[PDB]
Amino acid sequence: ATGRIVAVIGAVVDVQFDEGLPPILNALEVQGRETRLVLEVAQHLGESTVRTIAMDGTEGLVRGQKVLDSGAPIKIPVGPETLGRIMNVIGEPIDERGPIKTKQFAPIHAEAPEFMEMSVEQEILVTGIKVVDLLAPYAKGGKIGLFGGAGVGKTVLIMELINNVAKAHGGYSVFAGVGERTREGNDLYHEMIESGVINLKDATSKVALVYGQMNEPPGARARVALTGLTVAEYFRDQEGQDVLLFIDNIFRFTQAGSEVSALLGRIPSAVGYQPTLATDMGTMQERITTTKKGSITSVQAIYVPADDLTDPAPATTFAHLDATTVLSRAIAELGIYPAVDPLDSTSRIMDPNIVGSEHYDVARGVQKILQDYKSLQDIISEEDKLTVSRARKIQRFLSQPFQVAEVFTGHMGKLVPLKETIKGFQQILAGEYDHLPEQAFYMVGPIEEAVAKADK
Template identity: 65%
Template sequence: MVTTEEKKKTGANPSVPAEGKVVQVMGVVVDAEFPSGKLPAIYNAVRIKQPASGNVKEIDIVAEVQQHVGDNRVRTVALASTDGLSRGALVVDTGDCIKVPVGKETLGRLLNVLGEPIDNEGPINAQEKWPIHRNAPSMEDQKTSWEVLETGIKVIDLLTPYPKGGKIGLFGGAGVGKTVLIMELIRNIATEHGGLSVFAGVGERTREGNDLLLDMKESKVIEKTALVFGQMNEPPGTRLRIGLTGLTLAEYFRDVGKQDVLLFIDNIFRFVQAGAEVSALLGRMPSAVGYQPNLATEMASLQERITSTRSGSITSVQAIYVPADDLTDPAPAASFAHLDATTVLSRLIVDKGIYPAVDPLDSTSRILDPNIVGEDHYNVAREVQRILQKYRELQDIIAILGMEELSEGDKVVVSRARKIERFLSQPFFVAQEFSGHP
């Protein structure tokens, strides 16, 4: 977050909006020149305006300052399309970073990255607006004790329990059920616990966003949920900041409303991808596999703000797309360090027709500990994992030689493992129209 001291150094004065002009347009990257001593601070929002002329419509877009490039110029990233924008257009410094409406007025509404409603249901008359760039809670404000969050999903509650106020990663390739699992969690938390949720759609399919909105309206879950969308068709600047917008809404409910909030982010990989696009547009040298050099810093700026405090908690469930099912890719690897539990969705389990396709051996939880979940729960979970691990080891023998070649003890293990697999699957409320199961 930009401090007042930094603003003084750049000469920015929020009471008198500084005006400049566009000097260069490179896609969504716009360079603007300001009078000497009136340079906007880094992360300030600037408004770019251009009147209609000929076939070009009137332009009024917001951009975020990313770099000071010398000669009284700043490099900004536009949060909307720059089609038709030309040099000489007016640029007005807002004197602050992007601010979004917060509070109960946002519940049941769908917002964009700037906090503007995009659900055609009128304006949001919120009492307060908060900046999207904020500091993480201090060490002394954070809560360190663990508490289990019941999800109503058997395989998760038994083998990878979610901590309240923790960060959970849903790992999986394309089409293994990450979004469906998130929708089920939203439904269960709202219906069974009456909890508030914030859903941030980061660079995902517009159709999925539309389906989610309609499903939530139908199930009345939307009354306890705020949604912010920056989908695939949006510029990279929007996809990079939409996660921070959703997080800011959740922080208000935690810090002011003193509530336990669920923050769903779908998809963290698209957040990283947007950061890589912005980094390339700004001319930074790429690092491993073409990702941005500040990947770890960018990830931490989002993740460190997601935590439990003495007043409330934010529990984050983040879908993380794994490129080519490679968990060593820098994008999923960068998120591992921040997570308290990981739920890995496996294509091999999808091929068996078992849903949710949670891999019980690859998935982990920091709180699967007898001191937290209890001795009985811990022992049952470990025994289930032992049986499933033994079954996995026997599968090659079964495939080559058949069940008949196994010892009687191994046949019992296989029988138990198959029963456990079926027990850990369950029909989802949100997938009822596809599965036919109520």
């Protein structure tokens, strides 16, 4: 069906169809434009008119300009041919490497899996990173809030997670740059190319990039997360994989939703947010889950406005987070990498009924010894020195060298299994290594490497 533009107000376009109105959330192609302009239907206004939000700039639009109904929501190419590419919210390649040649397209608007398709048991997603696996593990199919921004190695952690999940579990990754600065998007593209995660020559790329920049209208930045989620949903449902989905930033997803709702003329809720804040976040986050075919685990960079955790956007995001990973600069200044704060990172599955009694006991012992060490640092007896020594060793052992950094530091990349992590920290806690020096646990894999390094 073909309609015509009847109103252009900013990034809102009213289009009138003489026949066959398109359903809500459909994609409409504006005709006669140098570049592709997509409009997403949002309301049926009556008298055969629909209101739409624009996915690009609306300058140079004319009333009466023809618009073509596509008969589906925004469809993007899904498949392995998206790995190593960059696409925007409408599935167009923006890395100048030609068309993304897949065999199947998928709409970016789909429903969460039915109640009978949910995995009834929680389980751990093993990342091969010692501090994460031990103190704040990742649930397979859960949401992980990644706190901490610049100067703490967030990008190295993201690339290491991509690489570790590709190696261990055999699942690919998607990276949705919601509200991404173009400078940092270019930087990240090239950091991924250098560290081997993206490969421009062969078909062994591990991540698919989906960028919605900051200079795009609020609708594009609102739907880019669903685009990345659709790529990940293909990799889960059709390949039966354990996909990783990174969303940076999630607060920008909320802000784009707020701007879109304010443009559509809806009454703002509390603190200026969209009245549909919780349902926007819900219809997005409920698709990141474990089905009977695979799973999608989402690491989501969290920004807290005004450092107020009771703000509606963080407080609505926190209702969905199954884990929390806090990258601290104080830990990075201590040379410990990754800079994961071991006392501030939390996990909901850190529970003896899910991770086991042994894993839980080891993690609680590590946490208690670190708390004890900081309480002793406050003032600086007989065993206080023993706890100080063991906690120094625990701190040093939480650090670990990453594969994606081999071209910088030269060292090898360690993917520690979960059993080895539990065993190493168990042994350090039980006093099996009070003779080794504390510098023997720095930047090693399993504990065997610690004793082999103390042999030197």
